[PDB]
Scaffold this motif. Structure first.
Motif, PDB file in Angstrom:
ATOM      1  N   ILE A 136       0.806  -1.228   0.000  1.00  0.00           N
ATOM      2  CA  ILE A 136       0.000   0.000   0.000  1.00  0.00           C
ATOM      3  C   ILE A 136       0.842   1.282   0.000  1.00  0.00           C
ATOM      4  CG2 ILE A 136      -2.008   1.165   1.066  1.00  0.00           C
ATOM      5  CD1 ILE A 136      -1.296  -2.298   2.275  1.00  0.00           C
ATOM      6  N   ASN A 137       0.411   2.248  -0.810  1.00  0.00           N
ATOM      7  CA  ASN A 137       1.021   3.570  -0.868  1.00  0.00           C
ATOM      8  C   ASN A 137       0.117   4.640  -0.260  1.00  0.00           C
ATOM      9  OD1 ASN A 137       3.461   2.708  -2.351  1.00  0.00           O
ATOM     10  ND2 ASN A 137       2.073   2.456  -4.102  1.00  0.00           N
ATOM     11  N   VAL A 138      -0.915   5.048  -1.009  1.00  0.00           N
ATOM     12  CA  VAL A 138      -1.740   6.221  -0.669  1.00  0.00           C
ATOM     13  C   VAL A 138      -3.200   5.860  -0.364  1.00  0.00           C
ATOM     14  CG1 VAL A 138      -2.698   8.415  -1.591  1.00  0.00           C
ATOM     15  CG2 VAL A 138      -0.255   7.973  -1.737  1.00  0.00           C
ATOM     16  N   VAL A 139      -3.633   6.224   0.844  1.00  0.00           N
ATOM     17  CA  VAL A 139      -5.035   6.125   1.253  1.00  0.00           C
ATOM     18  C   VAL A 139      -5.634   7.537   1.255  1.00  0.00           C
ATOM     19  CG1 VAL A 139      -6.668   5.338   3.034  1.00  0.00           C
ATOM     20  CG2 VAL A 139      -4.600   4.023   2.602  1.00  0.00           C
ATOM     21  N   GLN A 140      -6.675   7.729   0.448  1.00  0.00           N
ATOM     22  CA  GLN A 140      -7.364   9.015   0.354  1.00  0.00           C
ATOM     23  C   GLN A 140      -8.859   8.896   0.680  1.00  0.00           C
ATOM     24  OE1 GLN A 140      -7.068  12.580  -0.782  1.00  0.00           O
ATOM     25  NE2 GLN A 140      -5.059  12.346   0.198  1.00  0.00           N
ATOM     26  N   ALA A 184     -10.185   5.510  -0.509  1.00  0.00           N
ATOM     27  CA  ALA A 184      -9.523   4.722  -1.545  1.00  0.00           C
ATOM     28  C   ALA A 184      -8.075   4.425  -1.162  1.00  0.00           C
ATOM     29  CB  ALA A 184      -9.594   5.438  -2.886  1.00  0.00           C
ATOM     30  N   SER A 185      -7.730   3.136  -1.126  1.00  0.00           N
ATOM     31  CA  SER A 185      -6.353   2.699  -0.877  1.00  0.00           C
ATOM     32  C   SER A 185      -5.684   2.270  -2.182  1.00  0.00           C
ATOM     33  CB  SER A 185      -6.302   1.575   0.167  1.00  0.00           C
ATOM     34  OG  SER A 185      -6.936   0.396  -0.297  1.00  0.00           O
ATOM     35  N   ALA A 186      -4.495   2.826  -2.423  1.00  0.00           N
ATOM     36  CA  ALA A 186      -3.732   2.610  -3.653  1.00  0.00           C
ATOM     37  C   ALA A 186      -2.472   1.776  -3.414  1.00  0.00           C
ATOM     38  CB  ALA A 186      -3.371   3.948  -4.278  1.00  0.00           C
ATOM     39  N   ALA A 190      -6.499   0.116 -12.384  1.00  0.00           N
ATOM     40  CA  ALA A 190      -5.408   1.095 -12.529  1.00  0.00           C
ATOM     41  C   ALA A 190      -4.249   0.654 -13.443  1.00  0.00           C
ATOM     42  CB  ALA A 190      -4.877   1.500 -11.159  1.00  0.00           C
ATOM     43  N   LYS A 191      -4.022  -0.663 -13.540  1.00  0.00           N
ATOM     44  CA  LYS A 191      -2.945  -1.303 -14.349  1.00  0.00           C
ATOM     45  C   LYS A 191      -1.497  -1.096 -13.866  1.00  0.00           C
ATOM     46  CE  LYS A 191      -6.434  -1.838 -17.550  1.00  0.00           C
ATOM     47  NZ  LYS A 191      -7.731  -1.119 -17.696  1.00  0.00           N
ATOM     48  N   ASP A 192      -1.145   0.149 -13.536  1.00  0.00           N
ATOM     49  CA  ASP A 192       0.224   0.532 -13.153  1.00  0.00           C
ATOM     50  C   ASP A 192       0.413   0.696 -11.633  1.00  0.00           C
ATOM     51  OD1 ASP A 192      -0.186   1.252 -16.069  1.00  0.00           O
ATOM     52  OD2 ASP A 192       1.914   1.861 -15.891  1.00  0.00           O
ATOM     53  N   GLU A 193       1.646   0.999 -11.218  1.00  0.00           N
ATOM     54  CA  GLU A 193       1.962   1.350  -9.828  1.00  0.00           C
ATOM     55  C   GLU A 193       1.436   2.753  -9.520  1.00  0.00           C
ATOM     56  OE1 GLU A 193       5.937   2.505  -7.363  1.00  0.00           O
ATOM     57  OE2 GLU A 193       6.074   0.548  -8.344  1.00  0.00           O
ATOM     58  N   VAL A 194       0.717   2.873  -8.405  1.00  0.00           N
ATOM     59  CA  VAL A 194       0.053   4.128  -8.026  1.00  0.00           C
ATOM     60  C   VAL A 194       0.874   4.892  -6.980  1.00  0.00           C
ATOM     61  CG1 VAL A 194      -2.211   5.192  -7.614  1.00  0.00           C
ATOM     62  CG2 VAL A 194      -2.105   2.814  -8.334  1.00  0.00           C
ATOM     63  N   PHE A 195       1.085   6.180  -7.252  1.00  0.00           N
ATOM     64  CA  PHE A 195       1.880   7.077  -6.408  1.00  0.00           C
ATOM     65  C   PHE A 195       1.052   8.050  -5.574  1.00  0.00           C
ATOM     66  CE2 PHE A 195       6.481   6.633  -6.927  1.00  0.00           C
ATOM     67  CZ  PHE A 195       6.563   5.714  -7.969  1.00  0.00           C
ATOM     68  N   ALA A 196      -0.100   8.476  -6.105  1.00  0.00           N
ATOM     69  CA  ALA A 196      -0.996   9.425  -5.423  1.00  0.00           C
ATOM     70  C   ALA A 196      -2.450   9.365  -5.884  1.00  0.00           C
ATOM     71  CB  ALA A 196      -0.482  10.844  -5.575  1.00  0.00           C
ATOM     72  N   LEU A 197      -3.340   9.841  -5.011  1.00  0.00           N
ATOM     73  CA  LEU A 197      -4.767   9.973  -5.305  1.00  0.00           C
ATOM     74  C   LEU A 197      -5.270  11.371  -4.938  1.00  0.00           C
ATOM     75  CD1 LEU A 197      -5.950   6.609  -3.624  1.00  0.00           C
ATOM     76  CD2 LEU A 197      -5.355   6.816  -6.047  1.00  0.00           C
ATOM     77  N   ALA A 198      -6.251  11.856  -5.705  1.00  0.00           N
ATOM     78  CA  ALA A 198      -6.849  13.183  -5.508  1.00  0.00           C
ATOM     79  C   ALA A 198      -8.360  13.175  -5.754  1.00  0.00           C
ATOM     80  CB  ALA A 198      -6.162  14.223  -6.383  1.00  0.00           C
ATOM     81  N   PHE A 199      -9.110  13.355  -4.668  1.00  0.00           N
ATOM     82  CA  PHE A 199     -10.570  13.359  -4.691  1.00  0.00           C
ATOM     83  C   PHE A 199     -11.084  14.777  -4.903  1.00  0.00           C
ATOM     84  CE2 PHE A 199     -12.198   9.272  -2.388  1.00  0.00           C
ATOM     85  CZ  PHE A 199     -11.439   8.478  -3.237  1.00  0.00           C
ATOM     86  N   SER A 200     -12.080  14.907  -5.777  1.00  0.00           N
ATOM     87  CA  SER A 200     -12.618  16.210  -6.168  1.00  0.00           C
ATOM     88  C   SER A 200     -13.541  16.829  -5.118  1.00  0.00           C
ATOM     89  CB  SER A 200     -13.360  16.110  -7.503  1.00  0.00           C
ATOM     90  OG  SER A 200     -14.463  15.225  -7.412  1.00  0.00           O
ATOM     91  N   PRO A 201     -13.360  18.140  -4.840  1.00  0.00           N
ATOM     92  CA  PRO A 201     -14.378  18.899  -4.114  1.00  0.00           C
ATOM     93  C   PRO A 201     -15.536  19.321  -5.028  1.00  0.00           C
ATOM     94  CG  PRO A 201     -12.165  19.835  -3.819  1.00  0.00           C
ATOM     95  CD  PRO A 201     -12.127  18.928  -5.008  1.00  0.00           C
TER      96      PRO A 201
END
Ligand SMILES: [Mg+2]
Ligand SMILES: [Mg+2]
Ligand SMILES: [Mg+2]
Lengths: 106, 223, 143, 318, 206, 67, 141
Positions: free
Chosen positions: D198-202, D211-213, D235-246
RNA sequence: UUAAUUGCGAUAACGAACGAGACCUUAACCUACUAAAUAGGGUUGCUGGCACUUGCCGGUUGACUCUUCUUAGAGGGACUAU
């Protein structure tokens, strides 16, 4: 009934630095437990004692020279305290190799 | 009492050296190895390590007291200000100086040289050192000077894993036909060494990986 | 604003001091002037014979003003340098011992230099004022 | 598919290396700070004019090592930055001066996070430990949850008014992400799911859909408030970051190939953002470390390894 | 235009020659373009410097030495001989004096003149000692820009030093004269003569 | 002359063999990982090993390598 | 109370503490101002950083330098370095960061060390050599 | 190729050790930590010198706090990185 502030310097001199550092740490811990105003484990220009010599016993080879050096570590631990407390502290607070020395009085 | 701090330290070192030399000379039969000086206010403790501790002790306050007196005479200090203790060394096999002394003793009494060296090596190995080396320089039958190297295991010659790792002992052995010289280098094992690093500085060792099972359904585990 | 004293480009200040001294006529000449090497590493005295000692004095005064407790030995060290030793390489030997002392004495007499505690010399208040005036004059000359 | 499309309307750059994280306050959209591997922090004030969307407003000679995780208070006056140098620094943003150094950690501090009340800070280091700091500089709670490495820590805001618990989520390297509360003072749940590491939880803007990446190629999303497993988005690839919309229900994912855009409720794979670089073969292509929105929901910022932040302004096609 | 003042007073002339133009010691670094094809970049100019002295490390890799300012290079070359080893200050002073002299000489950009001198004295094709058994036969060879430049720089300085032994004509003046000779190619300076000789030698092997 | 020695290379190889996951391309993380898993009596050596591992990782993106 | 920084300048053994406060426009070194210094030729070097960003960035910021170590040249260089650092530091702290960045750009495109400190220090002069590398004289004659 | 029996590859060799390396002391970077009337720097007493207005420049161990520089301690830092 007493409590008359003298301000006491503690000298910590030696070669084996780790031991010295440990001693210093111990002293500071002890000071903390007896709760006193104190200046820290002030460090001085760690004097190297150089003796440079021909490596050859007899002067028949190439001119090889060796600098035999002695690292020295001089530490001042200043206490705002009376003498009795210092005495109490210096009952223990001795570890092999390191020089413990009490200057006493301001 | 009291000089310049540096000077004082130097003097102390010199004193220690002198003491060591004296013990090598005086306590030769006593099987001496090392001195451990502890200078505190009033009572200065002097620890002495030997193989034959009993000899050093005497018959309760024999030789040791004499030595104390000698020390006092040498360096002006009074009775009580200098204390001397004699101790057993924790396995002599790792200690180079002791081994050297033993070798010397073997030589002086009358024994096979090569065989003695081999025996010493074996003893060292039994003790648990990573390796060791004996060098015997001088006349070993015939006039021409011969070196005789005898070794077991690794022997690190270069680097700071020497001042931390290998106990070295040099001795002269006096004989009727000519003076022998015995050098002995001992490879103490990294782990038992305690002081300094606990392993050889070049070496890198990696642990075994641990298995994890993926998927198995996401699921929820609640409290 | 503020009239500065340290901000003078060295030589000009000294020259001004010398001029002032010449104008006054109050210094009391050492007497061993010109019959002296001034430095131990000298084959020639000052080149312009009369004067130059005045300049030296001025320089000394400036140095005093700049610093704290200043003495004869330090002055000697300052006005020493390199010795033409012939076949042997240069060393460092100091200035003439008495001449500097005499200069200091003269300064004290006029009221430029005052005796300090702990060991050395400092500046007299009248002397300080004079120095300030000299600095001002120099500034005026420049401006 | 929709009509509102993502077009670059500015490239921001001031950091002389990797930008590890960026953040915006809930109160102020104008101030977005940026933390770099270059020991530094640079705050951007947003102006919208031509190319320079945000210019450097406060730079910092902050930590000694790497400003690796940055979290700013919801108000926007305390900026809390973490480092590999085991410390964490609180920052007065208008003046440009440090307040408190949170010294306690035995290893590199991999995540900082601030409370809803902007008081109870929470830090996690590559140690096994998760410390809880006060804005004064006091150790309150040492959380021992993960048996291996902790990397990310995030806080979920609460609406439904005030039930009691304060909700935290912590990413791990044991393949188990952990759920925390502060008041039942400690554990809530264990959200197992990830195949890789696991990398990024948003968490959601509401504070439930987290969401856990990972590194595998799938984002695993969780419903926290009702304590349940939601969905696994591709996602297919390695995930570095996540960004949820306001703005709406958009998820923006930083992948190994580039940027991939999705949505929360509708399982859609909308747009891919992949900018153009100078030089390069194929595998050398720089991918963004961390990406963040603002509060307007019109702009996206993405801190690339190549020093770059790229302002994608979401605007209608016709 | 516009003299902005401070608390610490700076003279007027200095203020005048400051911000508006990216200057040199006192005059224009600007203009001064290489008349000759090649040797551009390898004869510096380009980057504006305000003094002919830097701590700037250049003897670090290889082609970095061909990014060191021309005046600076000249000064460095001047430091040759044991009596003049180190003493960059002196060299810089000398260079300044030379520049002033050049300025005095029928106006013109002194930098430009210097550049021209550097260009002119640099030998084109030179002989290198080839083995081929034992005898010292020489076969002529093309000289790389940088090497040429270096040689040119050396030669002028050498000439100046030769002149300066037992002369009222202080080294700076001699250097200026040499530069003038090089620029107005009359083959009267040392450097040009040497170049010519080298070329002749090359010819006698081509 | 910065040719990495046998030892460093060997160590890197071993690391790659045993822990091909948890080697996140860039230096810094990888260095820390190396420090954690492999026991090095030094710091510089560890760094070197980390560097070599990173290089190997970079290579292994652009194909398979021998050993 | 005044907005101020204390900056160091470092080359060879020369160290220069420039103190950057706010006021009229005083730039002093050891009491004496920025003008004198007096290797005389190397004057313009210390003027360089000031020239680069202009006289405008000094009517607000006051600089006061204390220099030790080195010789003369080295001292000058140290002073220069200190001054370069000081302004930058001030800009970083109190003024806008854009200005600071611009300053940096100006310096880096003209990098005579400055914001990057000097690198070299002497090799120790080992035995058998009058210099560091330079040996005596082997004489197989 | 390497400063290197330094490595890659070819290959009845394979994996090893010593030596080279690693290591160790020092010289370099830390406006982040540890502290300093034995290293320093600030603000105000007392006043010294000014311009004469607030402001400069000082000296003086007075008091106070800091630690950039000085010092070491602990770490980090460069791995040929991109
Ligand atoms: Mg070895
Ligand atoms: Mg070695
Ligand atoms: Mg002479």
């Amino acid at each position: 009934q007493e409590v008359v502030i003298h301000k006491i310097r503690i000298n910590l001199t030696s070669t084996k630095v780790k031991q010295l550092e440990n001693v210093s740490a111990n002293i500071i811990k002890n000071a903390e437990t007896f709760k006193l105003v104190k200046k820290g484990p002030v460090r001085l220009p760690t004097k190297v004692l150089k003796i440079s010599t021909r490596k050859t016993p007899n002067g028949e080879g190439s001119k090889t020279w060796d600098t035999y050096e002695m690292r020295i570590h001089k530490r001042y631990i200043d206490l705002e305290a009376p003498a009795h407390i210092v005495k109490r502290i210096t009952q223990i607070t001795i570890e092999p190799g390191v020089d413990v020395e009490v200057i006493i009085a301001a | 009492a009291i000089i310049s701090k540096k000077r004082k330290l130097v003097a102390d070192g010199v004193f220690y050296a002198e003491l060591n030399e004296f013990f090598t000379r005086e306590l030769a039969e006593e099987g001496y190895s090392g001195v451990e000086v502890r200078v505190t206010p009033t009572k200065t403790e002097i620890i002495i390590r030997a193989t034959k501790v009993q000899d050093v002790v005497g018959e309760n306050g024999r030789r040791i007291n004499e030595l104390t007196l000698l020390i006092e005479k040498r360096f002006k200090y009074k009775r009580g200000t200098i204390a001397l203790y004699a101790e057993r060394v924790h396995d002599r096999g790792l200690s180079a100086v002791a081994q050297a002394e033993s070798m010397k003793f073997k030589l002086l009494n009358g024994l096979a040289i090569r065989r003695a060296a081999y025996g010493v090596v074996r003893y060292v190995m039994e003790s648990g050192a990573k390796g060791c080396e004996v060098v015997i320089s001088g006349k070993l039958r015939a006039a021409r000077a011969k070196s005789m190297k005898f070794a077991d295991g690794f022997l690190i010659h270069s680097g700071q894993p020497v001042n931390d790792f290998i106990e070295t002992a040099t001795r002269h052995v006096l004989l009727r036909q000519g003076v022998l010289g015995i050098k002995v280098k001992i490879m103490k094992d990294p782990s038992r060494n305690t002081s300094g690093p606990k392993a050889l500085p070049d070496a890198v060792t990696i642990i075994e990986p641990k298995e994890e099972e993926p998927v198995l359904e996401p699921s929820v585990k609640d409290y | 604003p503020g009239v500065s004293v340290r901000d003078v480009p060295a030589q000009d200040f000294i020259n001004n001091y010398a001029s002032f001294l010449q104008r006054q006529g109050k210094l009391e000449v050492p007497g061993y002037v010109d019959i002296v090497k001034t430095s131990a590493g000298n084959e020639l005295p000052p080149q312009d014979s009369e004067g130059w000692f005045y300049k030296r004095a001025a320089s000394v005064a400036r140095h005093i003003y700049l610093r704290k407790q200043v003495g004869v030995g330090k002055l000697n060290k300052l006005y020493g340098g390199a010795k033409n030793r012939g076949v042997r390489p240069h060393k460092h030997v100091d200035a003439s011992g008495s001449i500097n002392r005499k200069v200091l004495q003269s300064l004290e007499k006029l009221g430029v230099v005052e005796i300090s505690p702990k060991g050395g010399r400092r500046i007299s208040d009248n002397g300080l004022r004079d120095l300030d005036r000299i600095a001002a004059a120099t500034l005026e000359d420049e401006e | 598919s929709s009509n509102i499309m993502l077009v670059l309307r500015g490239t921001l750059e001031g950091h002389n290396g990797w930008v590890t994280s960026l953040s915006t306050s809930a109160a102020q959209p104008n101030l977005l700070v940026s933390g770099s591997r270059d020991k530094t922090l640079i705050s951007w004030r947003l102006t919208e004019n031509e190319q320079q969307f945000g210019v450097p407003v406060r730079s910092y000679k902050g930590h000694s090592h790497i400003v690796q995780d940055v979290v700013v208070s919801a108000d926007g006056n305390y900026a809390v930055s973490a480092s590999w140098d085991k410390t964490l620094r609180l920052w007065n943003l208008a003046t440009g001066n440090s307040e408190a150094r949170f010294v306690g950690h035995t290893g590199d501090v991999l995540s900082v996070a601030i409370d809803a009340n902007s008081s109870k800070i929470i830090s996690a280091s590559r140690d096994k430990t998760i410390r809880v700091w006060n804005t004064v500089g006091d150790c309150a709670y040492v959380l021992l949850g993960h048996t291996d490495w902790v990397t990310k820590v995030r806080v979920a805001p609460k609406n439904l008014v005030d039930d009691g618990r304060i909700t935290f989520v912590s990413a791990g390297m044991d393949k188990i992400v952990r759920s925390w509360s502060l008041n039942s003072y400690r554990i809530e749940a264990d959200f197992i799911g990830h195949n890789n590491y696991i990398n990024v939880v948003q968490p959601s803007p509401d504070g439930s859909l987290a969401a856990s990446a990972g590194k595998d190629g799938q984002i695993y999303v969780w419903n926290l408030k009702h304590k349940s497993a939601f969905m696994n988005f591709d996602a297919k690839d390695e995930v570095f970051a996540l960004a949820f919309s306001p703005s709406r229900f958009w998820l923006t994912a930083a992948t190994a190939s580039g940027i991939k855009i999705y949505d929360l409720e509708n399982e859609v794979l909308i747009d891919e953002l992949k900018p153009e670089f100078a030089g390069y073969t194929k595998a050398q292509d720089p991918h963004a470390v961390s990406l963040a929105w603002s509060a307007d929901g019109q702009t996206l910022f993405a801190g690339y390894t190549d020093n770059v932040i790229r302002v994608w302004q979401v605007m209608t096609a016709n | 235009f516009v003299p902005v003042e401070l608390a610490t007073t700076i003279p007027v002339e200095i203020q005048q020659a400051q911000q508006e133009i990216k200057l040199f010691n006192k005059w224009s670094f600007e203009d001064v373009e290489v008349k000759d094809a090649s040797l551009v970049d390898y004869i510096q100019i380009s980057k504006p410097i305000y003094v002919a002295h830097t701590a700037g490390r250049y003897a670090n890799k290889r082609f970095r030495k061909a990014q060191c300012p021309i005046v600076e290079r000249l000064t460095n070359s001047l430091m040759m001989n044991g009596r003049n080893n180190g003493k960059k200050l002196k060299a810089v002073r000398i260079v300044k004096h030379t520049l002033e002299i050049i300025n005095v000489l029928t106006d013109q950009n002194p930098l430009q003149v210097v550049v021209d001198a550097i260009i002119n004295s640099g030998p084109r094709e030179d002989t290198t000692r080839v083995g081929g058994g034992g005898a010292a036969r020489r076969q002529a060879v093309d000289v790389s820009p940088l090497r040429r430049v270096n040689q040119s720089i050396a030669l002028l300085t050498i000439g100046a030093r030769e002149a300066a032994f037992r002369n009222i004509k202080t080294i700076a003046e001699t250097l200026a004269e040499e530069l003038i000779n090089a620029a107005k190619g009359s083959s009267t300076s040392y450097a040009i003569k040497k170049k010519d000789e080298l070329e002749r030698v090359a010819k006698s092997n081509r | 002359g910065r040719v990495r020695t046998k030892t460093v290379k060997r160590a890197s190889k071993a690391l790659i063999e045993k822990y091909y996951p948890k080697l996140t391309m860039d230096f810094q993380t990888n260095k820390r990982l190396c420090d954690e898993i492999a026991t090095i009596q030094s710091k510089r050596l560890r760094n070197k090993i980390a560097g070599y591992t990173t290089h190997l990782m970079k290579r292994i993106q652009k194909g398979p390598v021998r050993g | 109370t005044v907005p101020s920084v204390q900056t160091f300048g470092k080359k060879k053994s020369a160290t220069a503490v420039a103190h950057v406060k706010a006021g009229k426009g005083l730039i002093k070194v050891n009491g004496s101002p920025i003008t004198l210094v007096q290797p005389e030729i190397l004057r313009f070097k210390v003027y360089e950083p000031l020239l680069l960003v202009g006289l405008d960035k000094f009517a607000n910021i006051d600089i006061r330098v204390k220099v030790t170590g080195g010789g003369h040249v080295s001292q000058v260089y140290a002073i220069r370095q200190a001054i370069a650092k000081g302004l930058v530091a001030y800009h970083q702290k109190f003024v806008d960061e854009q200005s600071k960045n611009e300053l940096k750009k100006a310096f880096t495109s003209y990098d005579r060390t400055l914001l990057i400190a000097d690198s070299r220090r002497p090799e120790p002069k080992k035995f058998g050599g009058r210099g560091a590398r330079s040996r005596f004289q082997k004489s197989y004659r």
